[PDB]
Design a protein around this nucleic acid. Sequence first.
DNA 1: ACGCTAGGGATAA
DNA 2: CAGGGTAATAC
DNA 3: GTATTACCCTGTTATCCCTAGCGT
Length: 223
Amino acid sequence: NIKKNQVMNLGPNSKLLKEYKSQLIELNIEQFEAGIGLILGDAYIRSRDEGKTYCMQFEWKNKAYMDHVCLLYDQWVLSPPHKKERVNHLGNLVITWGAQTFKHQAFNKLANLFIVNNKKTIPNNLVENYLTPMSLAYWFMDDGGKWDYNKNSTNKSIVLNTQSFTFEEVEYLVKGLRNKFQLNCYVKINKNKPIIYIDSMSYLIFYNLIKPYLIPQMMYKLP
DNA sequence: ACGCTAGGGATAA
DNA sequence: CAGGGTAATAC
DNA sequence: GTATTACCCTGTTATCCCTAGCGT
Ligand SMILES: [Ca+2]
Ligand SMILES: [Ca+2]
Ligand SMILES: [Ca+2]
């Protein structure tokens, strides 16, 4: 069987590469569960055909996290992250790291979880039926944060920046989180957009759910 | 005075 | 976060 | 020549974070 090391430098159309990809059939349990959090989060799952295959594109500032993810999707990621250095309209230099997996049908499973009546969206029962503590941990490392950033604060309330979703979508996410994890949470507004507020009352619950998956360089997001 | 909000910005998506 | 562009293989 | 496609690249902001100042 073809070893990843054997094709991680060939052309995208290489014969050996495709043979390699045919050795792979599906994502494992982690890759899938974390996948859910990443898609709700900062990851991007796209298809260049009509849905035959999907790949995942990653871009984050924190390099340590970018590596944790790549290492997680190891078999699916041929190259190390690429340093991206761009200039703003201001003339400032912003640095970030890029990376992605190759396309493969094994990714369709994750993608279809976010497809209804043929349009990307947030299904009503996504939380209840698929979001696991691992998924939640990754959603947090991506869009999570504190409610109160003031110095010397004691409020343990957490937040999930769901600003790119519609209020209806977030309302369903909230319902799922309350029912499945008994989390005391509710939608709030920021920039006239949806964010999830999780009362400090449930911090300890929330924390123990995701603690097994967060990494050191992400612990700063917690109160 | 000060804990807490919601307002707001230069990124980090 | 989304999509766009292409150097590298295949036939 | 035409089909493929992973690894960059660019277009654009909704992001997460900070903090002015409201309410008490
Ligand atoms: Ca995000
Ligand atoms: Ca993030
Ligand atoms: Ca965004």
